[PDB]
Each structure stands twice: as structure tokens, then as C-alpha cells.
Design a protein around this nucleic acid. Structure first.
Ligand SMILES: C/C=C\C=C\[C@@H]1O[C@](O)([C@H](CC)C(=O)NC/C=C/C=C(\C)[C@@H](OC)[C@@H](C)[C@@H]2O[C@H](/C=C/C=C/C=C(\C)C(=O)c3c(O)ccn(C)c3=O)[C@H](O)[C@@H]2O)[C@H](O)[C@H](O)C1(C)C
Ligand SMILES: Nc1nc2c(ncn2[C@@H]2O[C@H](COP(=O)(O)OP(=O)(O)O)[C@@H](O)[C@H]2O)c(=O)[nH]1
Ligand SMILES: N[C@H](C=O)Cc1ccccc1
Lengths: 99, 83, 208, 378
RNA sequence: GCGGAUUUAGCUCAGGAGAGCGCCAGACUGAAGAUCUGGAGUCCUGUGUUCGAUCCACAGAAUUCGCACCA
RNA sequence: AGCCUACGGGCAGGCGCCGAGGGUAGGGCCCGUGACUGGGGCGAAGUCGUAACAAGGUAGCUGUACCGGAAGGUGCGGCUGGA
RNA sequence: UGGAGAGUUUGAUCCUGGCUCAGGGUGAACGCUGGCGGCGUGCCUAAGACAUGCAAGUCGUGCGGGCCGCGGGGUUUUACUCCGUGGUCAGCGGCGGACGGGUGAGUAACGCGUGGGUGACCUACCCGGAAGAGGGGGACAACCCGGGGAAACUCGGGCUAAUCCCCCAUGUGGACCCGCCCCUUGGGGUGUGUCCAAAGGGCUUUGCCCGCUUCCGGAUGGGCCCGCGUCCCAUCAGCUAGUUGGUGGGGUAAUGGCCCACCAAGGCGACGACGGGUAGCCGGUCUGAGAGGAUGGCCGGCCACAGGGGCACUGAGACACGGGCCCCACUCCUACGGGAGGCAGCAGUUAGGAAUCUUCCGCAAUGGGCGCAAGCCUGACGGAGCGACGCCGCUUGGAGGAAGAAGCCCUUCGGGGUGUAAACUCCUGAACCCGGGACGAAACCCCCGACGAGGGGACUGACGGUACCGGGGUAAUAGCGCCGGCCAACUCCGUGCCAGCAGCCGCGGUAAUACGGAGGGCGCGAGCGUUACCCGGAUUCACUGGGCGUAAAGGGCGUGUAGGCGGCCUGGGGCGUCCCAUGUG
């Protein structure tokens, strides 16, 4: 009947459950960030936005995010931050973004 | 990856391969990327083996593991001998 | 294949005496020499003017029957000939003459084309050394066509080449009666051949 | 599952009046022997391997009994001790004689219903006399007394029941012993050209058509070329793709074996009951022949009127029956019962025929003649 | 294989083998037609029952429809 | 409210949009079949009359209109392929 | 280097016009018949349903164990059973399972074809170059313990190894925001800030081999986009809400209403929109003198699908035929408590149909997956089997033999025909018999050199004891269609508008070359006929290459829109047109 290839499935699952996680972190972590820019914060936002970055490029190592998807997430993430702190705040706290 | 191997032709009980370079994936007698020779494992003709080297030379200079027996013939036609 | 059956029955009909048996077809009895009329209950009765088609037909059937070769085989040659560049009319014959069985006849080894076949078939003939039994086989210019060693002593092949001592043969040939081995000089040109046939009709017929 | 030939093979079956116990005995026989060796069944004793056909025995199955009995090396006549011989007991005995069943073993069944020693001896006496009446050696046949039902129920209770443990089961062993000893193992014509009359044809779902029958002579194995002769318009030739014994793969079937022969590329529309499978060129289909025929006397169950030209009775050849037109010699208007004569016949359908082939002549359900093919005309 | 239905003049069809039709022939025609004259089974087979069988009984055959199982 | 933690967070679970199909409703397009009914095609010698071809024995034909067993008749107008 | 026409409307004629025949072709089928072999080829119908067996795995040179069979002592001994190696069963982990094989259902579409675009993109394994791998940590199977089930298989508990997952470091480099210079759709460089790396295993072990990580280039394989080309009906004429565009997002490897808000009202159509029908596309194939007409079976290329429909996950790559989830239909199994399956893979069964095969041998070769390799798998493939289905080669004999057996058919009763045919005589010798016996197979592997270049050694054949060679060696199958004309081939008898024939014309009514038998003849021959379908002839849809006064065909006439077409002369551009070269094909 069965022909041992199920392992792929078995593995499949695991691998899924695996990145599903980290991926969400990126999100929750990202939102958290923007939420502080929208809330017009400063450092904490960047600190987050900063941590954000790292968590992403990290996901790029595995079979999760890759190619430009990598950048895409960032090229936007920090793209908004700046365009949220330009509402007075000013990158007073040296974070990922550079003046 | 890309390979240098033989492709059957001729008739039944009468092989007549064709020294060629194709993507591994394509089928045996599939569509080649470029021919480089022919080989008759029976020498019915005095000219059974034959290989344009410059070409075979190139396809290697760009990476292209040839079948073990693709090496044979190639070699035999003095493809690697450098003096 | 090779017909099989009554022949001096065509040595008739066609009217034109053609040699299918050889030896006898010289006697005072090719039957044509005895019966100048077509076979059958009728045959000898006022015959109607053959239609412009019957002609083109009867000629063909003639020539073909001469070599005793199947329509299929015949036809194929014709076409091939119609294909090869040059005067199709002539050509045809060439290819039609290049048949081993034929050669082996003109080269005297055989008293008649029908007998020729047999010989060629039974391996009694050979070419450029190796032997052949493909009557159909088309001999190229420059080929040596001789009897096989084992055959060299056949009571027949003997009696045959016997008479050959003396007689000359086809300008496009060369028989070495001694070592009984002829050669193929070149493809004969119309003038060289001389059969009771107008190759044109045949051509025509095949455009019916 | 494979079948390995290890003991001499014999074909038997059950005959006897309706309800006397033929089918119950057949089941008992398989269960009883199953304890030792792990409507057509098989079972074996320490001496032989048996193929057993259980005859329903009804009037509408007459043609089936004919072919079934014709392939038996011996028959088991079941007679109920509570009823004694009945019409079918007599009918099956005559048929057995006419188709040549060589030996008869009697099993007086239902003795669990009769204890009176006198009644039991009377029944045996009646059966022996009945057999003598049709020329069977009634005074010599084995007559085993038992109960097929009690033996069967015992095996159902204890499938492992062995000989010597139960009186009823032991009665079945008495029968098995009698069968082993009284019914001789016939000599099989295994050295002659293969020939097997087709009994039935089926399609083994997902495997192809299969033709069953008892090999009359010769042998057959996968890869063998065989001709299907008779009945159809032309003889068909194919290759054997399988040979089975009771649905078990068989190395090679031999004369005497009742097997299933799976055929290549032939549909159940190309092979049928009555045709014969045979070595190519060994037998041919014919319709016209001459034969020496004995017209049965009225005292032998035949008719009191004789045969006449134009008569169209049924001719029974191996596993089928075909209508044939009788033609008597010039001057002869009739062949009377009790006489032996030679006449010509033209069947309405081709049949695999050969000189010396025996056949019976019946008009409806009555046997009126016994003949032998003496010359094939076409 | 098991069962039912079916199987009567050339065509259509019903216990003392019939009706209808047209159908066949003759005469006439140069012919055909039209008109006039005239004429006319084995009842699927066999056997049996009966004074007598298309009809009743048995055996069989063939056609047909449903059922059939699966080395 | 649960589970994990390296306290950021993850999973489970909850809600929503999309959603195969399923239901109900009302349309569109095509095929089959239907009592009867309408004409049409073809089929050796059945009926009725004679429209047309020779002024076809009232020139013929034709659009229209009415009418009559049937061809057809007639009215108006037209054409010659009629005089 | 290429083109032929005939029969049939009439008393006869010319014209028009349809019908018809002669040719070629087919994955054929049906009838009668049927000897040998080679190479090809074989479900066109129900993308209907399927028994059984086999079709995708492979690494111990990534990790730890279970079971089985060898070798060897640390405390003083059995026990915590610590170690090197050779089997087997799974587990973990890696790579393959996206190729290969099957089918044409759907699709009228950027699907296919062709030629370009990508400053809008990806690409595992393979090549080339640059650069590195220092420290800790983590948990899940296997396994052990207890439990439920007929089965399929599953829950609770306790351990553990990594090239498994994770963090910190180092960051040649690479990613992202802003600014500058260069270039121009998001391309190349650069400044600050921020962010991201690694895996060990094996031998001849401070020396290599196989791997790991990062980046740039190459090669191969794709995604997306665009111009032109690609079916019948207009008795389908108007179509459209994500519909057309826009700003901002979301989404992706990336462009884009692909998607979502908000806004603007557009977008397409007689150059045929929309709708119905039908269909996989091409390379080619068939016919034709060609132009065309028809076609898309085998093989090659593209697409599409895996019982019907939807959806994601894993991954370089799939929405994945022999992976997963759900709904539906269907079939099955059962211990009636639940579960199982998906041949449009090979072969085989059933149904349907006019009809389409062996449940074969082998991995020896080629090609593919994994591995350092030995090597394992491979119904891919290589071979064999079945069918005159096709093509080709070949046999049933050869030379003699009568002013001419017999039989049979004609007969003007002399004779004529079959007919050199036969018999008969000589010679050859398919079949069969015995002997020998392959090519396809040189690599991978082993030694020297450096495991390279170059040289030497060794193994391996399914088909097959077959081809083929040599010796012996018997005269050893013929059938089908036709014979009034077209169209080659005629007489007798039977029959009597009956029976029957028949492609069109037609034949048969008592002397039939037309029906049926016969003698004879013509044709083709292991085939010959028939039915079906495509092109031709058909200049019969006519561009080549036709027509409309009476043969079918001028609109009842006019006005005029779109469209089609356009006098003479001079000059500019150069789209059509024409030439050359080059890419492509
Ligand atoms: C019998 C059916 C089919 C047989 C087919 C072929 O038969 C065979 O050809 C077979 C070969 C002989 C055959 O032809 N059998 C064909 C025939 C063969 C006949 C013989 C031998 C015989 O001798 C004259 C012997 C039996 C002989 O008769 C006697 C019988 C007397 C019966 C009287 C019954 C009478 C008044 C009666 O009213 C009656 C009755 O009581 C019971 C049942 N019913 C219905 C009755 O009416 C006695 O028994 C003797 O022994 C072969 O066997 C074939 O292989 C087979 C089997 C293919
Ligand atoms: N009492 C009794 N009944 C029996 C016996 N054998 C059979 N039977 C029964 O009798 C009936 C007929 O049995 P069956 O074998 O079918 O008879 P068949 O017609 O000869 O095959 C069934 O009901 C059986 O159970 C026996 O030995 N004793
Ligand atoms: N051996 C065969 C198959 O089992 C015997 C048989 C035939 C026919 C029917 C049942 C049994």
C-alpha cells in the first residue's frame, strides 16, 4: 500500500510550522514598530524597527523569505517609519535609519 | 545541469549515437542544445568516432559533466591531451 | 513473383516474338513460329482496332514481361527513374538492365532470364568476391560478376559458358569466358539495347 | 496459491435421489479431510487427491449430469435409510451406466433416523438388487452406513476432529477408505496429443477468459499453442496463458485433471462448452460422417419404433449435443430396436470428430441409440 | 445452462385442416397491362394418443426475452 | 480562559473577508419526444376534368384581388418571351 | 524538369450545367485467400469502470538506535555493557520525488506560431573568480514505559545524536531608508546609520579529498510583456462594475484592477465587439503543374490535464498523476465499530465499437536519481511476442518435351482451344538435418605518474547457440477481381421485366458478349476485392483561373455616408515597393 515518501509530508509539516512562526514574528514585530511611528514615538520605534530588520534578514537564510521578498519587507517597513516620524519626532535616536 | 552525452539514432540492432550537449532534464532523444559529434559502436564506417573539439572544449569551459562514456569518446578523440 | 507458368503463350499475344525460354525459342517451334495468333478460344478472329489505351498498355505489359518482374517492382523503378535527372525514357531501362538476374543473363551464364534468377537465387553467383542471391540487386559500373567457386563445376553453368566461347556480348560488358567472370563497364545507352519496345508508350501509360 | 501434484488424482461425485443427502455428504467430505490435510470441490486422503462434483440431480440438470458423470472415475450413490431407493436412485444409476461410470460405492445416509437393524438391512438389500438390475456388481459394491449431517455438525463444532474421535466422522472415513480401495485409479493417456473437452467458460475478472474441463489425454502448460475446435465457423488458435487446479497455479495439467485453462486474447465469445482444446492439427471439425449404431431396445429404455431416414435426434459428443440428420442406406426404410447398423449423419453444427469416437443418441430426455464414428466424410 | 413466449397455403392469419388476398396458368398482345377461362399445406421435426391431429402428450430443434455464475 | 519563553514573542483557540458546492427563485440558448394537424418528395399500367405546347381551340404570361372540386376563372394594371 | 481526359439531357447539333469514372493517399475495417523474413506499426469509440504484479528512490563518507552474525579487557568477576567493523529493519537528516512515462477532456487564449522586450524578474545540482567557518546554547523521533483497534493506524509518559533548529561573534562582501555624482522606467558608483554568515565527515591527518557560508560572472532552465499570424454561424449587433484610467496601498521573484480603498467616467464593436457552435497548437503530413485544397496519426517542440471541483503547504522549482486538505460521484473492505481506492505508467480485464496486441526477457548498451566509489533503482530504455496493418526483400522451381495425350469447351463436324501446358528426362535445391558462432563492450574499477594530462591491466551480452559462415539436402502454397461502354478481356448453356446485376449510362419480356454456371481471356498476385474518408480530374468559389441580353445571375429607380479607386507639372520626406549585408528560420 504505502510507499515511504510520507517523510516528505512529515518533514513538510514540521518545516511549515517552523517558518510560520518566525514569519508572524516579523509581522507582529513590524506592526509594533509602525504603531510607534503612527503614535509618533522615537527611539523605541526604531529599536523595534531595528530589531524588525534583523528578524527578517534572518528569515532569509532558510527556505522562508528570500530574494527581494527579503528587501521588499524592509524597503517598505523602514520606508514607512521615516514617513511617520517626519511628523516632528526626527530620528533623534540613531537606529537602523540614517539621516 | 547541462551535460555532454550520447543520443541514440539509426535503426534497431544498429545503434548510431550522437555526441551532444543538452540539459540533463530533456529526454534521451530529446532536443539538444548543440551537437559535437557522432559515434558508431560498431565501426561499420572507417569514421566511427568524431568530435568537434573547439565546441566540446567550450561546453566544458562553461561546466558540463559529460556521461562517463561521453568522456571516453571525447577523451579518445584527444579532447583533454594538452602536451 | 517471376510469373511462373506458360510463357510461349506470350511469345504470342504480344505478337512480337520475345525470347523467354532461349534455347527452344530458337527451334522451329517458339509456337509463335507455329501459331502467329493470341491464345484462347478466340485469338484467331478478326481483331478490332486496339484503343489508344490498349496500345500504351500492351506495350508496357510486353517490356515488363520481358524481364519477368512484378508490377510493384517494375513500377518502383519507373518512378525512381522518372525521378532521377535526365531522360527518363532511357534511364528506366538502365536500372532495368542493372538487375543482377538480368546481367547474369546477358553475360551468358544463363540461357534465359528466368533461369538467370534461379542461379542468382541459389547463390551460384557472386559479386566482387562475396556472393549474392538478390535478383532485384542493381549492379554498379565496375563490378565483377562471376560464378561461385563451388558452382564453377556445375554441369549447367558449364554447358552455358561452353557456347559462350566465340560469341561477343553487350558493348557495356566484358566476359572473360576463361575464368568465367564478366564485368560491368557502364550503364547501356538506348542504342545499346534493342528490345521490341517503344519506351515512350510505357512512359505515357504511367500518366494514365 | 500453487498446486503441487503429489498423489494420484481421481474424479468422483455424488448421485442419488433428491434430499437423500448428496450435498450434505459433499460438505462433510471436505470438512472431515480438512482436519488432516490443510459444486466442484477437492479433498484428499492419505492415498489420493480427489476432485468431486456434487450433482444437483434434478431433471432440468440432466445434460449437466451427463457431462459430469461422464468424467467420473467412480460415483458415490447416496441412498436415505429412512426412504430406501426412490425414482432418481434408479434414474441416476441407468445414466451412470449409459455414460460408463466404471464403479459405484454406496453410502446409506440418515442412519441417525433409522435404528431398526432389519430396516437397514432391507434398504441395503434393495439397493444391491437395484444395482444388479442395471448390471452394476450390486453384490460386490461397498455399502457404508452413516450420517452426513451429524458428521458435518461435528466438524463445525470441532474442525480439528480427527479419525477415531467421533463415531459419525469415522463413518465418513469408512467411506473415504472404501473410495480409496474400491474405485481403482485408471491409467491416464498422458502420452497422447493434448485434448480437453470444454465444460464451461468464464471470465476471471481482470485476467481474461478461462475454459474449464477434464483433460482427456495429453498435457498442457503456459506457453502451449492450442486450437479451439468445433461449433464455431472456423478453428481458432491461441496460446495458453494459465493452467489452474481448483483455482491454484498448476505447473502442467495432465490427462485426468479437471482444470481451468486461461487463454490469450480470446473472449468468452470465442470459446464455449462443447468445443475442445487440443494440440494444433490433432483433431478437426466435421459435420458429415458414417457410424456403426446400436438402436436400444424398448426393454433398455429406448423406443419400440426404429430409426428412419430424415430422423433428427440429438447426438452427444463429449461435452455437448448437436442435432443430426440420419440417412439410412438405399433400400433400408428402418432400423429396429435391438439391431446394429451403419448409417450416415449430418450434424447442423461442426464438432471435433475422429474415427472411433463414441457418442450417444437421445430424443429429448430419452436414450435411443449408442454409436461409434467409423468414417469422416466432411 | 434455468425458465417463459414464439414456430399452420405464395402473402395475412383463425379434434373432421380453413378465410381473405391476391397468387399461378391458358386465351389475347408484337410484348406487358386491362378483360375473359381455369387452377391451386408436410401447419418446425419425430414418436405417441385418437375412427380422425395445426389443435392433445412426450422427446427434440430453432427464434426470442428474462435469469445464471466466475479457474 | 489555555501551552511554551531566553519576557520580545510563538502555538492553540476566537472573529471576519474570499469561498467549492448545496438550496430556492426567476431568465436565456439547443436537443429529443407529442394526440392531431400542415403542406413536400418518391412509387409500371386506379378517379375527375383539359389549364399549358400549333389563335391549344377564350394569345400567353405576370403583381394583386376575389372566387371555384381540380386544374383554373375573372377584375384592374403590366410585358411580348404574343398578334 | 511541369499541367492528357472520358461517360451521361437530343432524331442529330452546339452551348450551359450537375452527376459519374480513370490517379494518389489512410492509425482502417469487412469478404474470399494466405508460404518465409527484415524493418515499421497497432482503442480513431467511453478523459467509462478496473482484479493481480511491477513501475522512485538513494546516501553508514551526515546522526543515534532495534534486531542478526564476527573480533577485543577496564575494578579483583557477572552489572553502569565503554570501543573499531559487516548485515538487516525503520527513524532523523540530505538529494531526488516538479524529470521521465501517459492522455487530449478542457482551452478561440499571447494557447500555439513567429519576431522582439525585461531600467519589471527568478534559476537547485555544474562551471570561473573573491572571501571566510571562533564560541556556547536548544528539542524531536528512534528507543523505553503504560494504553486503544479487526484493520487503517493513534493518544498519554520519560530520554537522546547530529551536515537538525537557535543566539552571540567576526562581515571580503551583500541587503534596506535618506543625500551626492553618472546614467535614464527600479542601471552603475559612493557617504553616514542599520542589518545578515558557516557543517562537519573521510583519508596517506598542521597535507590533501568530499562538503559549509557569502558575493560577483558564466552556463542551462523559466516568469511576465508586446507586434503580426492562427475555425464555422451576423437567422449572435450591440457589449462592459473591476468594467477604462487615476493617486495611495496590498501582493509577488517581478509588471500590471492581479487585489483593496478613494477619486475620475471611461473602455470595445460591421477592420465584426458580445453570444452559440466546434477545436489542443506547431515542425510537418496527404494531394495539386502550381496557386491552393485537406490534415495535425507515428517521431520532435509548446500547452493542458491526472474520476469531477476548490485550496494551500513543502521547496531552487509544484499548486505537484503514483504528496497533503475538503466537498461530490462512484466501487470496495469490514470483526458492521470504521476505514480503503483513484492504470490518461507497463501488461492485462470489462463496456462500448466496424476495430487496435504479451499479465514477455533484461538492465548488457544509451539516458536518468542518489553515492567518493563499489553500487542500488529504472515497465525510460534496450530486445522479444501477437495481427499480410504498412513498406521492402523472397519462394511455389529451371532447360528441354507433339505438326500437339487425356479430360473439359467450343465446332461451318474437317477441326479449333486450353498448350509446352502436362506427362516424361535431365539440374538447382526453400524447407528440414549436423558442425562452428558474433558486432553491439569500453568505460566506471586496479598499478605507475599527481586521484590530472599520457600509458598499461581486468570485469560485463537480454536479444542468443539467434544472425551469419561451412557441410548434407526433398520439386517444395495460389489466390482474388474483372471481361456491354467508359475500361484490357467472348463464346456456349440455363433463366425468360422472373431470378438477379448495377460507379454513371443502363441489362433481363424464350436465340442476353450486361443475370447464373461453364470453357476461354484480361488484370494484379500472398494477396485481391468491398465500404468509409481526404486531395485530384473540378477553370465546378475562378488570385493564378469563371461569370450575369435569352442558360443561375443587375439591386424597381434615385440621393448619399463609410469605404474603394484618382488629371497634368516641379520640388522635400521615404511609409508601401525594390536592392545589399547580417541575425533568424
Ligand atoms: C447417456 C447420455 C449420453 C452419453 C454420451 C456418450 O455416451 C457414450 O457414447 C456411451 C458409450 C457406450 C453411449 O453411447 N451410451 C448410450 C447408451 C448406452 C447403453 C448401454 C451401454 C446399454 O447396453 C445396451 C446398457 C446400459 C444395458 O442396458 C440395460 C438397461 C436397461 C434399462 C431399462 C430401463 C427401462 C425399461 C426404463 O423404463 C427406465 C428406467 O428403469 C429408469 C430410467 N429411465 C429413464 C427409464 O426409461 C442394462 O443396464 C445394461 O447394462 C460414451 O460414453 C461417451 O463418451 C459419452 C458419455 C459422451
Ligand atoms: N437427519 C439427517 N438429515 C440429513 C442427513 N444428510 C442430509 N440431511 C438433510 O436432508 C436435507 C437434504 O440434504 P441435501 O444434501 O441437500 O440432499 P440432496 O438433494 O441429495 O443434495 C437437508 O435438510 C439436510 O440437512 C443425515 O445424515 N441425517
Ligand atoms: N480447477 C478448476 C477450478 O477451480 C476446477 C473447476 C472448474 C469449473 C468450476 C469449478 C472448479
Amino acid at each position: 500500500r504505502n510507499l515511504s515518501a510520507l517523510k516528505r509530508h512529515r518533514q513538510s509539516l514540521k518545516r511549515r510550522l517552523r517558518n510560520k512562526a518566525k514569519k508572524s514574528a516579523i509581522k507582529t514585530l513590524s506592526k509594533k514598530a509602525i504603531q510607534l511611528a503612527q503614535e509618533g514615538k522615537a527611539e523605541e520605534a526604531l529599536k523595534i524597527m531595528r530589531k524588525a530588520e534583523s528578524l527578517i534578514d534572518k528569515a532569509a537564510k532558510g527556505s522562508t523569505l528570500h530574494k527581494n521578498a527579503a528587501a521588499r519587507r524592509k524597503s517598505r517597513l523602514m520606508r514607512k517609519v521615516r514617513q511617520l516620524l517626519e511628523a516632528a519626532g526626527a530620528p533623534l535616536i540613531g537606529g537602523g535609519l540614517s539621516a | 545541469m547541462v551535460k555532454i552525452r550520447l543520443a541514440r539514432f539509426g535503426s534497431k540492432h544498429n545503434p548510431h549515437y550522437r555526441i551532444v550537449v543538452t540539459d540533463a532534464r530533456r529526454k534521451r532523444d530529446g532536443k539538444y542544445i548543440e551537437k559535437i559529434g557522432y559515434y558508431d559502436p560498431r565501426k561499420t564506417t572507417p569514421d566511427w568516432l568524431k568530435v568537434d573539439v573547439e565546441r566540446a572544449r567550450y561546453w566544458l569551459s562553461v561546466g558540463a559533466q559529460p556521461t562517463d562514456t561521453a568522456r571516453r569518446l571525447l577523451r579518445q578523440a584527444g579532447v583533454f591531451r594538452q602536451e | 513473383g517471376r510469373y511462373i507458368g506458360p510463357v510461349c503463350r506470350l511469345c504470342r499475344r504480344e505478337g512480337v516474338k520475345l525470347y523467354l525460354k532461349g534455347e527452344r525459342c530458337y527451334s522451329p517451334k517458339c509456337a509463335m513460329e507455329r501459331r502467329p495468333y493470341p491464345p484462347g478460344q478466340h485469338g484467331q478472329k478478326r481483331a478490332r482496332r486496339p484503343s489508344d489505351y490498349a496500345v500504351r498498355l500492351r506495350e508496357k505489359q510486353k517490356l515488363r514481361r520481358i524481364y519477368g518482374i512484378s508490377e510493384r517492382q517494375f513500377r518502383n523503378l519507373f518512378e525512381e527513374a522518372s525521378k532521377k535527372k535526365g531522360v527518363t525514357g532511357s534511364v528506366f531501362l538502365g536500372l532495368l538492365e542493372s538487375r543482377l538476374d538480368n546481367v547474369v543473363y546477358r553475360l551468358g551464364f544463363a540461357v534465359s532470364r528466368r533461369q538467370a534468377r534461379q542461379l542468382v537465387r541459389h547463390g551460384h553467383i557472386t559479386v566482387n568476391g562475396r556472393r549474392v542471391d538478390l535478383p532485384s540487386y542493381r549492379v554498379r559500373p565496375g563490378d565483377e560478376i562471376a560464378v561461385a567457386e563451388k558452382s564453377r563445376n556445375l554441369e549447367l553453368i558449364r554447358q552455358n559458358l561452353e557456347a559462350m566461347k566465340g560469341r561477343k556480348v553487350g558493348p557495356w560488358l566484358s566476359l572473360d569466358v576463361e575464368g568465367m567472370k564478366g564485368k560491368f563497364l557502364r550503364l547501356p545507352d538506348r542504342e545499346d539495347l534493342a528490345l521490341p519496345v517503344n519506351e515512350q508508350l510505357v512512359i505515357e501509360f504511367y500518366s494514365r | 496459491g500453487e498446486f503441487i501434484r503429489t498423489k494420484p488424482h481421481v474424479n468422483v461425485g455424488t448421485i442419488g435421489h433428491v434430499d437423500h443427502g448428496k450435498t450434505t455428504l459433499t460438505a462433510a467430505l471436505t470438512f472431515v479431510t480438512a482436519a488432516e490435510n490443510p459444486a466442484h470441490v477437492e479433498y484428499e486422503t492419505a492415498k489420493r487427491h480427489y476432485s468431486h462434483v456434487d450433482c444437483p440431480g434434478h431433471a432440468d440438470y440432466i445434460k449437466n449430469m451427463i457431462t459430469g458423470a461422464a468424467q467420473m472415475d467412480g460415483a458415490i450413490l447416496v441412498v436415505s435409510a429412512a426412504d430406501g431407493p426412490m425414482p432418481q436412485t434408479r434414474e441416476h444409476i441407468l445414466l451412470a451406466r449409459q455414460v460408463g461410470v466404471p464403479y459405484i460405492v454406496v453410502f446409506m445416509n440418515k442412519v441417525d433416523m433409522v435404528d431398526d437393524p432389519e430396516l437397514l438391512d432391507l434398504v441395503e438389500m434393495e439397493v444391491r438388487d437395484l444395482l444388479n438390475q442395471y448390471e452394476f456388481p450390486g453384490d460386490e459394491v461397498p455399502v457404508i452406513r452413516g450420517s452426513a449431517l451429524l458428521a458435518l455438525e461435528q466438524m463445525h463444532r470441532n474442525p480439528k476432529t480427527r479419525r477415531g474421535e467421533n463415531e459419525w466422522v469415522d463413518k465418513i472415513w469408512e467411506l473415504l477408505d472404501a473410495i480409496d480401495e474400491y474405485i481403482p485409479t485408471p491409467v491416464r493417456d498422458v502420452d497422447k496429443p493434448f485434448l480437453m473437452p470444454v465444460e464451461d467458460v468464464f471470465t476471471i475478472t481482470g485476467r481474461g477468459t478461462v475454459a474449464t474441463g477434464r483433460i482427456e489425454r495429453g498435457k498442457v502448460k503456459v506457453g502451449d499453442e492450442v486450437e479451439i475446435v468445433g461449433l464455431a465457423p472456423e478453428t481458432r488458435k491461441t496460446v495458453v496463458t494459465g493452467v489452474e487446479m481448483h483455482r491454484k497455479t498448476l505447473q502442467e495439467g495432465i490427462a485426468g485433471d479437471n482444470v481451468g485453462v486461461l487463454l490469450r486474447g480470446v473472449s468468452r465469445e470465442e470459446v464455449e462448452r462443447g468445443q475442445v482444446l487440443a494440440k494444433p492439427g490433432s483433431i478437426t471439425p466435421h459435420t458429415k460422417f458414417e457410424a456403426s449404431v446400436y438402436v436400444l431396445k424398448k426393454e433398455e429404455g429406448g423406443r419400440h419404433t426404429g430409426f428412419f431416414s430424415g430422423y433428427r435426434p440429438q447426438f452427444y459428443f463429449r461435452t455437448t449435443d448437436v442435432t443430426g440428420v440420419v440417412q439410412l442406406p438405399p433400400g433400408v426404410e428402418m432400423v429396429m430396436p435391438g439391431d446394429n447398423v451403419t448409417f450416415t449423419v449430418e450434424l447442423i453444427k461442426p464438432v471435433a470428430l475422429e474415427e472411433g469416437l463414441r457418442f450417444a443418441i437421445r430424443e429429448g430426455g430419452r436414450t435411443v441409440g449408442a454409436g461409434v464414428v467409423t468414417k469422416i466424410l466432411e
